[PDB]
Each structure stands twice: as structure tokens, then as C-alpha cells.
Amino acid sequence: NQYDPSLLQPVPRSLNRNDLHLSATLPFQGCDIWTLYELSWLNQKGLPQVAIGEVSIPATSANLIESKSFKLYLNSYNQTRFASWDEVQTRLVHDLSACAGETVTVNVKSLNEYTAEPIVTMQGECIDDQDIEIANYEFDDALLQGAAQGEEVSEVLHSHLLKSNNQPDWGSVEIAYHGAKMNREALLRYLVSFREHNEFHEQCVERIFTDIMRYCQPQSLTVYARYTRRGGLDINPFRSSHQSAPNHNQRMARQ
Amino acid sequence: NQYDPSLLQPVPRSLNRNDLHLSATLPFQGCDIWTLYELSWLNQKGLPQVAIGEVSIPATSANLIESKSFKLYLNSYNQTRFASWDEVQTRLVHDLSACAGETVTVNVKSLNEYTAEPIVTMQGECIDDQDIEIANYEFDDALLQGAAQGEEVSEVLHSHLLKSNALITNQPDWGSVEIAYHGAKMNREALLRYLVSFREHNEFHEQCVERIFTDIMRYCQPQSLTVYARYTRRGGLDINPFRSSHQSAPNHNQRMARQ
Amino acid sequence: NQYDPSLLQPVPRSLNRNDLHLSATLPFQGCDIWTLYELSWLNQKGLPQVAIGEVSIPATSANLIESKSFKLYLNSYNQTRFASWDEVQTRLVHDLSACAGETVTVNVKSLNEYTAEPIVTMQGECIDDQDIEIANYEFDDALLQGAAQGEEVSEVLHSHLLKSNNQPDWGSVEIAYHGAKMNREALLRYLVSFREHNEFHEQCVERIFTDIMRYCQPQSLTVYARYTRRGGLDINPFRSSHQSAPNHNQRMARQ
Amino acid sequence: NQYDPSLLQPVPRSLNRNDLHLSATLPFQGCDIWTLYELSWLNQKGLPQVAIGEVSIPATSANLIESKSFKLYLNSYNQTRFASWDEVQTRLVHDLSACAGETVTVNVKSLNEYTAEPIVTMQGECIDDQDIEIANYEFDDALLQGAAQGEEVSEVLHSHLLKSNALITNQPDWGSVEIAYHGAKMNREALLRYLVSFREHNEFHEQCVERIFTDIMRYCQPQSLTVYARYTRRGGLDINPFRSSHQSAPNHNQRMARQ
Ligand SMILES: [Cl-]
Ligand SMILES: [Cl-]
Ligand SMILES: [Cl-]
Ligand SMILES: [Cl-]
Q1: How many other CB atoms are there within 10 angstroms of residue B125's CB atom?
Q2: B166 touches chain C (CB under 8 A)
Q3: Which residue of C lies nearest to A241 if distances are taken between CA atoms?
Q4: Are residue C30 and residue C137 in the same domain, yes or no?
Q5: Most CB atoms closer than 10 Å: which of A75, C36, C135, D63?
Q6: 3-class DSSP state for residue B72?
Q7: Does residue D239 share a domain with residue D223?
Q8: Contact call for C232 and D232, based on CB within 8 A
């Protein structure tokens, strides 16, 4: 198995967005940030090289990249000789851009760039410690009905309780908004109800964004989730009414 | 599927050790340290809980625990209600100890315990930055023949270049390895070629560490030796086998960059 | 006063580096991150526009930019009509790159990109709460002699107590390293001794880096300081043995 | 230079108000909220302390405090040893109240109190995004003549476009302003042109807010009005004047993006 760009499989963003009752004109902007922990190839002399890739795919791209296919594509680098680290970054930009349908940003970082980098947590207030009982795990977006009745605020909330299905995927999510203050029990119950829900990580973030916008009507909204890796890759979708990218890319405890 | 300890699959250590032709007395001591990044369950009221586990299995245990089965076992907690964090930790100790055949240690930590914990590298000198050509990756232990010619020295060397055989594991697995020894100085080209050759071998993880230890012992004959690998996670957990002539365990569990 | 690039004044990085006994080959890599809080100009129709600029200047550039001159240069935009926000970003890149001597990165952000952005603190452990007496404020780099005797660690430490002089400037600083564990009292005393010391912000960060490297000999070192603004601009120098840029740009409480 | 309360410079409010031709009874109530971002001093053992102060001065005080003098006064704390944080807060209240001529409120907060505090924007609709041409920036209050033609409405409007006269302040100063009123609906083009015209005026900060209030009152005649500006800091502190027919103060001190 030598280097093989045809392993990459796009999935159109439209599939789920149509499900969310979205027009071609988006309520949000943003990007999908991917971390590639397994990136490895051979140098020109056949000596293995290892790196961590950091990739940003614009949320306006026609397609996302299916994660298993991304992994298989990356494995095709492992036994292939490349002229330099620059050639590797160039090939990644080229192939991932073609697949997504829009220019993708790629940084290929040596492992020593991570030495003494701290693990971080999310910004704002954690909503997870609530003494409440969950009697049903079925997804219910109506859990947000009347969820923001409070005074006008700007607030950042987060939760580590995102899970979606067949093996489970795990995430933390940060919600920053300007609008009527949100009921934290309703928000927590809403997030927990994704547990048996099936969908891609990018799709969950867009669903949270559009449900909050519909039910809660904030003036400004940002939703940023950081998911644990599968197949050596993690995905961190960011969707915002006013912001193009998150102001930090740093790994969380489970990542 | 809810809590199911029957999902755990023991593998006798002797299966792979037999092929190393050891002495009745194990040449090394040590442990297998696992990090469980996915640990989650429900509290008594049904609210999800999340944690990171850290498990140490003695290298003297009769059995290791097969990694896929360990993943499936942990997944069985996800939808199960437990009365307390103590209960979860206690069951982990019970079930994993039963599987391995010896008492295992388990720490269940809240995510906040990791905030600000730094990513680490290994001790000593990295040997990866060499101007050499490699074209044949087949496993060759003979690459170590005559590898230690030096004056007797104490050093610590490490490499980030361990990778498994893709056919054997289906998807490649990845690791870094740290080798600390006192003995005739080891040729770093020979050692690097040898480590790289694991990508065409049939042993990885715990078996790879024991193979490296036994091959270095026989070819290089050091007075003291420690071989410690830290592998990237597969299925939400990672394995970090430590084997040594004189030492029991690494001084911590801190994660490396790819982990 | 219309737009005037000649207001920009470079200062060579060599001035201080020569003082630190540095070769032309640097012990560190990095960048100076600037935040421009006062950026304003007129659109093509004469209607004022306001934005926050984010600028990164490579630490390899021949020159830094003197802060008062940067402010005066930016004021020259205030009464000048520009075709679009893109033209403004283009002119900033052009002029700042010419002044620094290397390509500078510029992002011009609308104010609504900051709505509901949280204030952050530094990573790792704060060293400031120590019950110790300071009898002298004179700069002493020898405070670090024998300061790292401890076991091999990877650690992140920070302090909010950086001050340098004529009006005072204020900063917080984050030190991430892999090496022998540092004595936190010695480090705190060392940082406090900058109080009456005179130098540019970039110069302080490089001095901390080189003093720690000389006295403490860590395998890997990163020093990142975030200073409070003067004249509407703040400077955030980042210097690292292995890292090119910080992984977060976010304002601290005093910024 | 160590602690020196004589550095504080009072300015009588009447100096500028005289030019507004008010009634013996002030038409508004309110306060000037200041944020002190640079506050630092030494503890009894000489170790530096850092904090952010928040000060509220009643709009009825005889005097305002000149901003440069306030900066210099605060700088005088930097090298001075104080026994406790309480002592620092107490002296601030004493000295600032003496200067202003009325009791001022002072909160001294540790930096950790700001962690996670979000940046805010103002209430209501931003009026800045208009397709209009402006070429003459001279101050013109007459821009408000006949500006409120509407049916009576309650609305809140804001603009980020306040800037001072560069010659007068030497270096330009910057602010956003929020105007909440009940009355005949205000023409937004007229209001924007008027606000933009402050860049060629001789009044800013507290005086600008009072001028805006008095001009809107006379030209537009609303039943109720509040004018609140938040200015970017100069010399490490910022001023946020609030003036209202019916309201005492804003509900908080949260910083805006440029602040
Ligand atoms: Cl518990
Ligand atoms: Cl390390
Ligand atoms: Cl105190
Ligand atoms: Cl807001």
C-alpha cells in the first residue's frame, strides 16, 4: 500500500443540513478542526518520520471528510517515501482540499512541539454537576422549549457529557452566547439526550447550534465541541454566528 | 449492552514467552500500565459520569488482557447505573484482577485532575535523527549482533519509531520506546534499524517490549537494563509495558504527544 | 493627518540580543503577538469603521516595531478613506512587514467577533502566593543560580507580577519547561527583580528565556508573556526552543 | 514616587455644565463608573499585589476626577507597602471621595475574579451599519433638528463610533454609546451623523455623555431617556458615564471588546 488519495471519501454537508431545515445560506460560520495523532511516512532515505497533523476545514466546504476514510488515506503514507516534511504538508493540503471542495489549512508539527504543553479544560461554567434524575435517553429537542427565559446575559457554559452512537464517541461542548439567560437543567438534559442519537460529530454541533437558535433565540451564539479520537483522528467542530475560528486549539483530558 | 465482565479476554503470558525461550526464572520484572480515556457510566439517578482510569497489571500475572475485550468490557459500563465512584473502582479492581490472575491496581480520576497536566517526552537521547537509509523492513534480530562494542557506560536512549505490522493488527499501532542500560555502549544505527524492523514482525505491545528486552540481553549483554514502551491508544485505551532487570515501574503515567 | 507609513519606526532585535551574548543563530523561535484595540478608519463613503487588529511578527525579523510609532501610524488611518476592510488588512500587512523586515500576519476582526468571549488566565500553577519578604528591587539574574536542582519534570508555571519601567508596564508570564524541577521562590524573586529594570517587552521575554536556559538548563523551554496595553496596543512575546507560536491568543484580566 | 493623594486633580462639574445651560435642577441622575486595570501595590513584606478596581462616582458629586491625575495617583501605590487589601480599598474610598466631594464606591477585586468573565456588547440595535456618506465631521447639534418624527416608541439604540478630537486630547479617545428612550421615533441617520460629529468637538467622556443627553432632550423631547457611554481606557483606566432621566446606574461593569 503506497500513497493513495482515492481512499478519501467525502460526505456532503447538505445531507444533515437539509434535515435541520437550513437554506443554502447558513445561520453560522466556522470550521472543523482535526487532530491527526498517527501521521507517519518515510523520508527520502526510507527512515520513518512521525508528526502530529492539525487540519482546519471551512464549514462552508461542500463536503466533510469521512473519518474512517481519512484514517485509511493517512495509513497510505506510512510506507511511502516523501522528499521532505514540506512535500507531506503540500500533499495533505492538496488532497484534503480536493475532497472537502474548499481550501483546507494543514500544519504538520514535530512531536517536540508538544513537550510540556498542558492539558486544558473548557471555558466558562461546567453545567454537569446537578442532582437530577434522567428517566429517558431518547433525543428530545423540545427539552429546550422555554429554556431561555432569564435576563439578558453573555455567558459561557460547558459540559463533558456528550456521547453519540456503532461504538460510542465522546465529547465535551462549550456554548457561548449573548441572549436571555439559559436554564442549565434544560440544557444539560438536552445534551444528555444525544446519548442514543446517531449522527456525525459535525452534525451534532450543527444540531445543537440550530436547536439553541430556534428555541432560545440568542443574539450571538458559538458552539464548540471537542471529541475524543477514533482511528487516531479527532474532530472538533466550531460553529458561530459571529466567529470564524476558535481562539484556542488545545487538547482536553480525554483527547 | 450493560455491565458484562464476561467480555474480558485473558491471554496467558506464557503463550508468547515460550517463543522467547526464557529461563524458568523470568529475566525481568515490571508491569503493564494502561490508561483508560473513555471510562463512563451512569450514577444512581441516571446522570452520566466521566473519568480517566489508570491500571497497573504486574508482569508476573498469569495473563494479560486482550485490548479489544478490555474496550468492550469498559463500554459495558456506559449505560449501567452504579451507586458511587467507589463502586466503579472496586468492580474494576475485582474484574481485572480476576482476568489477569493477580491483583491489579486501579485509579479512577475525575477529568479536573488532569487540568494543567503537561505532555511529556522520554528520558535521555532520541536516536531517530540519523542519516541512514532503510529499505528492507523485515524483522531481523541479528541486526543487534556485535552492537555493543563500547566502553561500559550508563545511558538512556529513546525512539518514537515503533510501528506494528499492518496485516497482523489490521490497522497499524504506534509507540515510543525508552531503553536504559549499563553495559558496553550500543551502536545507535544498529539499534534504530532493529527497532524499525518491528513493522514486519508479528509481536507488538507487551510482546514487543519483552522481545526487545530479551534480544538486547542476549546480543548486548548489559549489566542492567530497562525497556519501556508507551503505545498510542486503540479503542480508547493505551498500553505502556515496562520491563527491567532491576526496576519495578516508571515513576509516573504522564502521556506523550501522540497518546 | 492622512495615512502615513513613514510614522513606523523599527528597532533592531540585535540591540538587546547582543547584550544577552547571543549569536546570529538564535536559541529560540517564536513571534511577537500584538493586539490593536484602537484600529479605526473611514470606509469609501466616509463612515467610520472600528475593528480589533491581531498581528504576529516573527521573532526572526530583523526589527521589532516601536510601540509609540505603531500607535501614531495607526492613528493615521482614522481620517482616511479605504476601499474595503480587505484593503486595510493589505496595507497593514505591507507596511508592518516592511518595517519588521519579514512577512507579518494580520487579522482585522469586527467587534462582534468578541461578543461573549471569556477572559482567560494562564496555564499551569501560579507561583505568586508565597509568603516571602523582598528586601531589594534591583535586577539580579543570579537569583536563578542553582534554581533548578529537582527531579526531571515537565511543568508549566506562571506569575502576574511582571512590571518594568517612564510610566510602568505590566505583565503576566507563563514558563513551560522540561528539565530539572525549578525552585519557585527563586523564580518568583527573579521575576520581581525586573521591577525597576528598563527594557522593551520583547527584550524582557528574551532575557527571561536566556537566563533560565543558562542557569537552569532545561531540555525544552517556552516563555510567553502577555502585557497590558499602552497607547491602545498590547504586545505578547512568545519564545520557545521547540514551538513556533502559542496555541492560544486570548486576553487576560488586565489586558 | 510613593503614595501621594495630592496628585489627584478635581474638576468642578459646573465648569462644563454651565455651557449646557441647564436648569437649577439637574435634568438627569447617574454615575461615572471607572475600571482600574493597573492597580498594584506592595504587601507589608514587599511582595507585589495586583488587582482590578471598579469605582462609581455619583453624577451629583461637585467634582469629577481628571483622568491623567487619577492614573498618576494610582501609580503612586505601585512602590508603596500596605498592610492589607482592606487598607488599599479604604484609602481609595477616602481619597477619591474627598476629591469628588461625595462618597464614591470602590471594589478591589483579585484577578481570579475575572476568569471566565465574558466580553459584552450593548443593548438594542446597532445603528452603525448605514449606507450614507459623511464628509464633514464638524460638530453640529442641529443635525438633531426634527430628528424625532415617529409614533411614540420605546427603543434602545447603540453606536461604536464615538471618537474625540485629536488636537484637543492630543491622542484620540474612543467609545461606544447606548441610548434608551421612550418618545417619538428617532431618525437613525440624523443620530449617527450627530454622534460622528463629536470627533470635531471639544467635549468627550463625561461631558460628551451630558451633551448627548441634553441635546436629545431638547431636540427630540422624549418622555424618558438614558445615555450611557463606555470609553476605551487611557493610562490604564476607563470611564463609563451613565446619565438618565429615570435610572440610577447600569446593571453591571462588564467590559466591551475594545475596552
Ligand atoms: Cl460518588
Ligand atoms: Cl518531558
Ligand atoms: Cl490582605
Ligand atoms: Cl453582550
Answers
A1: 12
A2: no
A3: C113
A4: no
A5: C36
A6: helix
A7: yes
A8: yes
Which residue in chain C is spatially nearest to A116 when comparing CA positions? C154
Report helix, strand or coil for B148: strand
Ligand nearest to the CA of C156: 2
Beta bridge partners of B237: B36, B234
Q: Residue C109's Cα: distance from chain center in Å?
A: 20
Same domain, D99 and D147: no
Query: Could you tell me if D73 and D101 lie in one domain?
Result: yes
Max Cα distance, chain A (Å): 64
Cell 478490555 belongs to which residue? B70
For residues D91, D92, D94, D97, the Cα torsion angle rounded to the nearest 10 degrees is: 170
* Local structure of B139: helix, strand or coil: coil
CA distances to A36, A161, A192, C159 from B109, in Å:
26, 16, 21, 28
CB-CB contact of D181 with D226 (8 Å): yes
The phi and psi torsions of A58 (rounded to 5 degrees) equal -60, 140
Report the amino acid identity of residue B141. Answer: D
**C137 and C239 housed in the same domain:** yes
Instruction: State whether B214 and B125 are in the same domain.
Output: yes
Which of A127, A71, D174, A232 has its CA nearest to residue C78?
Answer: D174
Distance CA A225, CA A212 (A): 15
How many whole angstroms separate alpha carbon C233 and alpha carbon D140? 31
Among A116, A134, A195, select the one facing B45 at the smallest CB separation: A134
* C154 part of contact set with chain B, CB < 8 Å: yes
Closest listed residue to residue C39, CA positions, set C88, C90, C93, C101: C88
* Residue of D121, D156, D259 to mutate when probing chain A, most A C-beta within 10 A: D121
Among A184, A205, A207, A186, residue whose Cα is nearest residue A126: A184
Query: Method of determination?
Result: X-ray
Instruction: For residue B106, give the C-alpha cell.
Output: 486501579
Q: Give D239→chain A minimum CA distance, Å.
A: 21
What 3-state DSSP class applies to B229?
strand
DSSP letter for C41, please.
Answer: E
Spatial contact of A159 and A128, defined as CB atoms under 8 Å apart: yes
Angle in degrees, CA C95, C96, C97, rounded to 5: 90
**What whole-number distance in Å separates Cα of residue B120 and Cα of residue B106?**
22
Q: Are D168 and D210 contained in the same domain?
A: yes
Domain with residue B213: its CATH number is 3.30.1130.10
What grid cell was written down for A149? 427565559
**Radius of gyration of chain D, Cα coordinates, nearest whole angstrom:** 19
Q: In terms of residue numbers, what domain contains A43? A: 1-116
- The cell 475594545 sits on which residue? D258
Q: What does each C-alpha distance from C64 to A66, C10, C52, C232 come to in angstroms?
A: 44, 6, 20, 17
Burial class (CB in 10 A: 0-12, 13-18, 19+), D184: middle
Distance CA C255, CA C114 (A): 14
Picking from B116, B120, B254, the nearest residue to C124 by CB comes out as B116
- Look at the block and give the residue holding cell 495509513: A75
Q: Do chains D and C touch (3 or more CB pairs under 8 A)?
A: yes
* Strand-strand pairing, B148-163 and B125-126: parallel
Task: Among D91, D116, D141, give the residue marking a domain's end.
Answer: D116
Tell me phi and psi for residue A36, to 5 degrees.
-105, 100
Burial environment of residue D80 by CB neighbours within 10 A (0 to 12, 13 to 18, 19 or more): middle
B174 shares contact with chain A (CB less than 8 Å):
yes
In our burial notation (b when 16+ CB lie closer than 10 A, e otherwise), range A238-248 reads bbbbbbebbbe
Q: Distance between CA atoms of D55 and D236, rounded to whole angstroms?
A: 14
Q: How many domains does chain C have?
A: 2
Q: Which residues contact D38 (CB under 8 A, 6 or more apart)?
A: C168, C170, C228, C254, D71, D74, D75, D236, D237
Q: What is the resolution of this structure in A?
A: 1.8
Note whether C134 and C237 are same-domain residues: yes
Kindly list the protein residues that place their beta carbon closer than 5 angstroms to ligand 4, a single-atom ion: A 154, 178; D 120-121
